[PDB]
Amino acid sequence: MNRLPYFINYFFDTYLLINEDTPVGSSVTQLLARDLDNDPLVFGVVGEEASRFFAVESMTGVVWLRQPLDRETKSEFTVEFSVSDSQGVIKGSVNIQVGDVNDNAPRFHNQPYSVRIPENTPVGTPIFIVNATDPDQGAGGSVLYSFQPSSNFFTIDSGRGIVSVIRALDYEVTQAYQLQVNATDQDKTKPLSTLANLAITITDVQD
Ligand SMILES: [Ca+2]
Ligand SMILES: [Ca+2]
Ligand SMILES: [Ca+2]
Ligand SMILES: [Ca+2]
Ligand SMILES: [Ca+2]
Ligand SMILES: [Ca+2]
Ligand code: NA
Ligand code: NA
Ligand code: NA
């Protein structure tokens, strides 16, 4: 009698990690299968979802990505591949893990930002709290804040987003400030950053 072939890839037993920045059309893996008769094998993928995502080269088992992955929309799923000799087809399921890349700059909410303070606001007064969110995994999802460029009059707590006065103000010299708040993520190799305006109105006080 003929013996049906069997898949041998490790990832049928564990998972296949594919990073979300894998370009469309690129090869993500090659299905490996063995057969007692040493028969020539044809390879496939099966299932509606798995077929929109993956294509397999029949003769080689090379698996190519048919469309973009996005860890922030869908971080994992389960697909079925097929292997056949002449006489029958075997299926195997594979859990796909979509690997994170740092692909999102920080996002600010609740804009625009403005605050109004007296010119006699004491040095050290906290006047405003900014926040930017970032959906990436790890350090690429962690935000540090700073003015771009630095201000001689205001500072931001790089971790907490707290804006505070660091030098005496003067309505007579400057009645209004328009500052760039920089939110940068903490990705080691490609940090991404976003800017947002802070309007600081200075109110006159009699001296
Ligand atoms: Ca066989
Ligand atoms: Ca993404
Ligand atoms: Ca990401
Ligand atoms: Ca990010
Ligand atoms: Ca003054
Ligand atoms: Ca004054
Ligand atoms: Na925050
Ligand atoms: Na985050
Ligand atoms: Na950016």
Q: β-strand 89-99 against 16-19: which pairing, if any?
A: parallel
Question: Cα angle vertex 198, ends 192, 199, to 5°?
Answer: 160
Given resolution (angstroms): 2.1
Strands (E), the chain: 6-7, 16-19, 27-30, 33-34, 42-46, 54-56, 62-65, 76-84, 89-99, 107-108, 113-118, 126-129, 132-133, 143-147, 154-156, 162-165, 176-185, 193-203
Instruction: Show the tokens assigned to 68.
Output: 């973009």
What dihedral do alpha carbons 58, 62, 64, 70 form, nearest 10°? 130
Ligand nearest to the CA of 101: 3
* Known binding-site residue numbers: 2-3, 20, 35, 37, 39, 70, 72, 85, 100-104, 119, 134, 136, 140, 170, 172, 185, 204-205
What are the backbone angles phi and psi of residue 12, rounded to the nearest 5°?
A: -75, -25
Answer for the pair 201, 114: CB distance below 8 angstroms, yes or no: yes
Q: What is the 3-state secondary structure (H, E, C) of 133-172?
A: ECCCCHHHHCEEEEECCCCCCEEECCCCCEEEECCCCCCC
- What are the CA-CA distances from residue 21 to residues 12, 63, 65, 71 (Å)? 23, 16, 11, 9
Instruction: Show the tokens assigned to 122.
Output: 């004491």
The residues with which 46 forms a beta bridge, in sequence order, are 80
User: From the CA of 169, how far away is ligand 5's center (Å)?
Assistant: 7
In the chain, after which residues does the backbone break, taking C–N over 2.5 angstroms as a break?
Answer: none
Single-letter amino acid code for the residue at 7: F
List strands edge to edge, sheet with 193-203. 113-118, 193-203, 176-185, 143-147
Question: What's CA 123's distance to the chain center, in Å?
Answer: 38
Q: In 10 A of CB 152, how many CB atoms?
A: 7
Local structure of residue 8 (DSSP, 8 states): -
Locate tokens 């994170």: which residue? Answer: 100
Answer for the pair 191, 111: CB distance below 8 angstroms, yes or no: no
- What are the CA-CA distances from residue 79 to residues 44, 71, 88, 96, 116 (Å)? 11, 16, 20, 7, 57
Answer for the pair 54, 134: CB distance below 8 angstroms, yes or no: no
Locate tokens 């697909």: which residue? Answer: 79
SS3 131: coil
- CA dist 138 and 71 (Å) reads 13
Method: X-ray
Locate tokens 């090869």: which residue? Answer: 27
Answer for the pair 158, 182: CB distance below 8 angstroms, yes or no: no
* Known binding-site residue numbers for Ca(2+): 2-3, 20, 35, 37, 39, 70, 72, 85, 100-104, 119, 134, 136, 140, 170, 172, 185, 204-205
